[PDB]
Amino acid sequence: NNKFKVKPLPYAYDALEPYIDKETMKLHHDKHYQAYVDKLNAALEKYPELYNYSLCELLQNLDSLPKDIATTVRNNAGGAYNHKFFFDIMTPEKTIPSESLKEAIDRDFGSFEKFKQEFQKSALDVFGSGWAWLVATKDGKLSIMTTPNQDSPVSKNLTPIIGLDVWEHAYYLKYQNRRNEYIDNWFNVVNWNGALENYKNL
Amino acid sequence: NNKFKVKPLPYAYDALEPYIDKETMKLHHDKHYQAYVDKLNAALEKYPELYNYSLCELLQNLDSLPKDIATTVRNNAGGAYNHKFFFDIMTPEKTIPSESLKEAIDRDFGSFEKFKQEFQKSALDVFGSGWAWLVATKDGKLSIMTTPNQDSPVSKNLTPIIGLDVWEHAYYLKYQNRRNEYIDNWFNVVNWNGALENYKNL
Ligand SMILES: [Co+2]
Ligand SMILES: [Co+2]
Numbered sequence: 199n200n201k202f203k204v205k206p207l208p209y210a211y212d213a214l215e216p217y218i219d220k221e222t223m224k225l226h227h228d229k230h231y232q233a234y235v236d237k238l239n240a241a242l243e244k245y246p247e248l249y250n251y252s253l254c255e256l257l258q259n260l261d262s263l264p265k266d267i268a269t270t271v272r273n274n275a276g277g278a279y280n281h282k283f284f285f286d287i288m289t290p291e292k293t294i295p296s297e298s299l300k301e302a303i304d305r306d307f308g309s310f311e312k313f314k315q316e317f318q319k320s321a322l323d324v325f326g327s328g329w330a331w332l333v334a335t336k337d338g339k340l341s342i343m344t345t346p347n348q349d350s351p352v353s354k355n356l357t358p359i360i361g362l363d364v365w366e367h368a369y370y371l372k373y374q375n376r377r378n379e380y381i382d383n384w385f386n387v388v389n390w391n392g393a394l395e396n397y398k399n400l
Numbered sequence: 401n402n403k404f405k406v407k408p409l410p411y412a413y414d415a416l417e418p419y420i421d422k423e424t425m426k427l428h429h430d431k432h433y434q435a436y437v438d439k440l441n442a443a444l445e446k447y448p449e450l451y452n453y454s455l456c457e458l459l460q461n462l463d464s465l466p467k468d469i470a471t472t473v474r475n476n477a478g479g480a481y482n483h484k485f486f487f488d489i490m491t492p493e494k495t496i497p498s499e500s501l502k503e504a505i506d507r508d509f510g511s512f513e514k515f516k517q518e519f520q521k522s523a524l525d526v527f528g529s530g531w532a533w534l535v536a537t538k539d540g541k542l543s544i545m546t547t548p549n550q551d552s553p554v555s556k557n558l559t560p561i562i563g564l565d566v567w568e569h570a571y572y573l574k575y576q577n578r579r580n581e582y583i584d585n586w587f588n589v590v591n592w593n594g595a596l597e598n599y600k601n602l
Contacts, residue, residue: 229577273527325475326549327528327568347528366529366568367577375431375569 200249201239204232205282213290217383219372227285230367234277234348241270253279257352276348280329280361287360287396289389296390298338299359299397306340314385316342317362321381324364332359332393338400357400360393402451403441406434407484415492419585421574429487432569436479436550443472455481459554478550482531482563489562489598491591498592500540501561501599508542516587518544519564523583526566534561534595540602559602562595 207227212220242248245264248256256263256275263271295303295310307313313332320342321330328346333356335341340359343351351358362384369380409429414422444450447466450458458465458477465473497505497512509515515534522544523532530548535558537543542561545553553560564586571582 225576233577326530367572370569370572371576374427374573375435 201242202235202249202253202278204235204278205285207285209290214288214387217386218288218369222368222371225371226281226363226368231278231281231285234274234281238271238274238278241267241274253282254352257350258355260353272353273348276350279352280348280350280363283358283361284363287389287392288384288387289392290387291389291391293388293390293392295393297394299390299394302334302338302340302397313342318378318381320344321362321364322378327365329361329363331356331361333357334359334397334400336400338397357396359396360388403444404437404451404455404480406437406480407487409487411492416490416589419588420490420571424570424573427573428483428565428570433480433483433487436476436483440473440476440480443469443476455484456554459552460557462555474555475550478552481554482550482552482565485560485563486565489591489594490586490589491594492589493591493593495590495592495594497595499596501592501596504536504540504542504599515544520580520583522546523564523566524580529567531563531565533558533563535559536561536599536602538602540599559598561598562590 204227207223211223211227214223239249245267248263251259253275256271257279260268260272294300300310303310303313307316317330317332321344324330324344324346326346328344328349330344331342331351333341333343333351335356343356345351351361362381364377364381369377373380373383406429409425413425413429416425441451447469450465453461455477458473459481462470462474496502502512505512505515509518519532519534523546526532526546526548528548530546530551532546533544533553535543535545535553537558545558547553553563564583566579566583571579575582575585
């Protein structure tokens with residue numbers, strides 16, 4: 199069986215309280231993430247050789263996939279990849295920026311504080327469903343960008359370092375309309391060690 | 401003062417229970433709808449003569465508004481118009497299709513049941529944030545279409561007859577990921593008399 203799978207949450211469903219509620223973690227992982235994976239697998243039944251592509255490979259070749267599944271793969275491989283990434287980039291452990299990622303943030307944004315301000319503003323300004331990302335070019339230059347729906351920076355040859363889901367399902371149960379509060383709180387759970395590995399994998 | 405205003409909810413905040421929760425009605429009207437109106441008014445301070453356009457006029461002329469506010473007006477006039485419309489198209493009273501709208505539904509969809517099935521499927525299939533609409537051409541021909549985010553059929557010279565908000569904020573508190581259940585329940589509160597007036601105003 200080479201079908202795509204949902205990665206088990208890397209910590210307890212209540213591990214991110216009080217910043218993200220357990221009920222949301224259950225729904226987000228067990229229902230939303232699970233649905234993207236199921237829908238992707240269903241779409242590929244017609245072209246089973248595609249089960250041997252990685253999620254990244256699907257995302258890097260959306261415009262050359264068979265026409266009849268291009269959109270479904272974009273949405274659902276996007277959803278599968280972004281959510282796997284998202285749960286991996288959070289942690290109950292305390293972490294801070296370090297080594298080359300820490301230096302790069304200072305270099306490219308001036309300071310951690312300026313980076314944080316810009317990231318929070320970009321996340322807040324996403325209109326409709328989408329994501330805010332810290333991304334790196336292949337040479338390690340950092341910037342902040344957003345994507346709509348389940349579109350991914352991977353499709354633009356940019357490497358996600360950290361990323362925040364600002365679909366309303368990610369925050370409504372606890373924060374309702376107050377996305378600003380969600381964004382501010384989320385920084386308490388960003389896994390900076392994971393982000394560092396993401397940066398080093400360039 | 402010719403600034404755009406939030407229309408007071410046309411019934412009690414708990415009037416749509418048990419199909420839509422009071423807490424959602426409060427948030428949806430008092431926070432989300434209110435925000436679109438505030439943001440629109442702010443954007444027009446620079447061009448106060450635009451306060452004399454109707455929401456429809458703004459929406460019909462997005463591509464000819466001053467470049468610096470075109471997008472903000474699209475999103476926020478869209479939000480203001482769609483939500484005013486949405487709260488107006490629901491009711492605690494019992495209503496059914498009648499007169500010319502009833503006939504037109506049968507003519508254009510074959511039966512009310514077929515219309516309902518198609519509408520529900522279109523609403524379910526909206527990916528990301530958006531709306532499902534029953535719309536009429538200027539000659540009264542009916543069809544179902546969806547729009548993303550706060551885009552509106554009005555911008556395409558189509559007249560909304562009924563419309564369903566499928567942004568997650570519209571249903572997450574009560575239905576969480578189960579948009580299908582939200583959509584099915586919503587039909588209990590559709591104001592068919594209001595829809596009829598919408599249809600007759602062609
Ligand atoms: Co999500
Ligand atoms: Co809404």
